Amino acid sequence: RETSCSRPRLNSNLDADLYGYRWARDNVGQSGATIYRLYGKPNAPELFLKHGKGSVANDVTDEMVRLNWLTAFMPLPTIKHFIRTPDDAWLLTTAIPGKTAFQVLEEYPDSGENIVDALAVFLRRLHSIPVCNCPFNSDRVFRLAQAQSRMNNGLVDASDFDDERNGWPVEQVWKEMHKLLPFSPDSVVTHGDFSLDNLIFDEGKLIGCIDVGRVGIADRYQDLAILWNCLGEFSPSLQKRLFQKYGIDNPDMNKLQFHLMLDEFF
Ligand SMILES: NC[C@H]1O[C@H](O[C@H]2[C@H](O)[C@@H](O[C@H]3O[C@H](CO)[C@@H](O)[C@H](N)[C@H]3O)[C@H](N)C[C@@H]2N)[C@H](O)[C@@H](O)[C@@H]1O
Ligand SMILES: CC(C)(C)n1[nH+]c(-c2ccc(Cl)cc2)c2c(N)ncnc21
Numbered sequence: 001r002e003t004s005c006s007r008p009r010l011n012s013n014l015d016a017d018l019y020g021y022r023w024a025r026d027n028v029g030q031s032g033a034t035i036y037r038l039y040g041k042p043n044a045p046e047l048f049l050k051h052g053k054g055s056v057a058n059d060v061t062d063e064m065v066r067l068n069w070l071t072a073f074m075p076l077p078t079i080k081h082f083i084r085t086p087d088d089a090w091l092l093t094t095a096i097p098g099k100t101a102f103q104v105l106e107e108y109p110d111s112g113e114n115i116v117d118a119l120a121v122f123l124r125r126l127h128s129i130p131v132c133n134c135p136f137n138s139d140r141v142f143r144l145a146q147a148q149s150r151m152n153n154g155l156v157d158a159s160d161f162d163d164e165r166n167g168w169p170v171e172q173v174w175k176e177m178h179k180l181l182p183f184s185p186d187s188v189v190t191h192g193d194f195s196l197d198n199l200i201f202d203e204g205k206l207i208g209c210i211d212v213g214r215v216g217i218a219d220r221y222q223d224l225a226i227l228w229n230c231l232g233e234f235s236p237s238l239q240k241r242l243f244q245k246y247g248i249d250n251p252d253m254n255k256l257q258f259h260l261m262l263d264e265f266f
């Protein structure tokens with residue numbers, strides 16, 4: 001049953017949301033989206049605008065729905081507006097004020113221990129979300145298939161491997177990684193890119209996380225591995241402290257190595 005109706009309309013287009021901001025172009029970002037910072041507008045918060053074209057549009061779309069879901073549970077940027085056209089995605093979010101964990105670690109070297117404890121506690125909060133809440137699958141089976149396609153499509157950044165794999169052909173990382181399998185299933189809600197760049201401190205407090213496009217159910221080491229790796233630029237004591245504060249007695253080196261190798265593909 002269908003009735004014939006009149007012509008309705010929408011109330012908000014992207015143009016009005018952008019009035020009176022200064023524009024800046026930041027670096028690429030997780031999956032290569034163009035990133036704009038919107039600032040310098042009186043009585044209006046700093047915003048971020050992400051624009052993905054083609055394949056990258058899917059990544060931006062993926063980030064949009066995860067922002068939408070996860071913000072019910074954790075402090076995340078707020079979606080102001082999102083647009084999807086056939087070859088394009090635009091995602092406008094409110095900025096989380098402050099500096100990245102990386103920035104604060106460099107500016108307050110003596111605060112490393114407090115920074116790691118905060119990071120560990122925040123990660124525990126994230127991991128405590130019961131998986132029954134989460135509609136996203138990011139498990140190793142799913143990620144391995146993503147990794148395979150990126151390799152096969154010629155997309156892996158072989159110049160950006162960790163030092164222990166510096167100069168390895170992508171195919172060698174792929175083969176060697178498969179020797180660490182299988183290992184015991186573990187499932188928690190994960191961030192997916194839990195680096196020092198993606199946690200935001202303001203006035204000495206960890207107040208939020210960003211770049212949530214890889215969020216979903218996966219092994220907790222997906223997040224522990226990536227952060228552990230980042231802390232490796234700073235000190236082995238901070239690396240160790242992460243696991244200690246988190247509450248793990250004997251870091252599973254197999255799972256650790258696997259998730260570090262897996263992230264080489266992304
Ligand atoms: N390609 C896009 C991705 O590029 C980076 O990810 C890469 C890491 O940076 C690499 O590691 C290097 O940088 C770390 C700090 O990030 C250092 O601790 C480490 N010792 C360094 O070797 C790691 N080998 C691969 C991983 N794909 C971004 O983080 C990620 O968001 C983005 O999507
Ligand atoms: C990339 C994106 C849009 C997720 N992004 N990036 C940043 C960011 C903040 C500080 C620095 Cl120094 C660099 C980036 C950021 C933010 N604060 N709030 C929300 N999204 C942010």
Ligand SMILES: [Cl-]
Pocket residue numbers: 032033034051052053056
């Ligand atoms: Cl793009």
Ligand code: NA
Pocket residue numbers: 070071072073074075076
């Ligand atoms: Na929230």
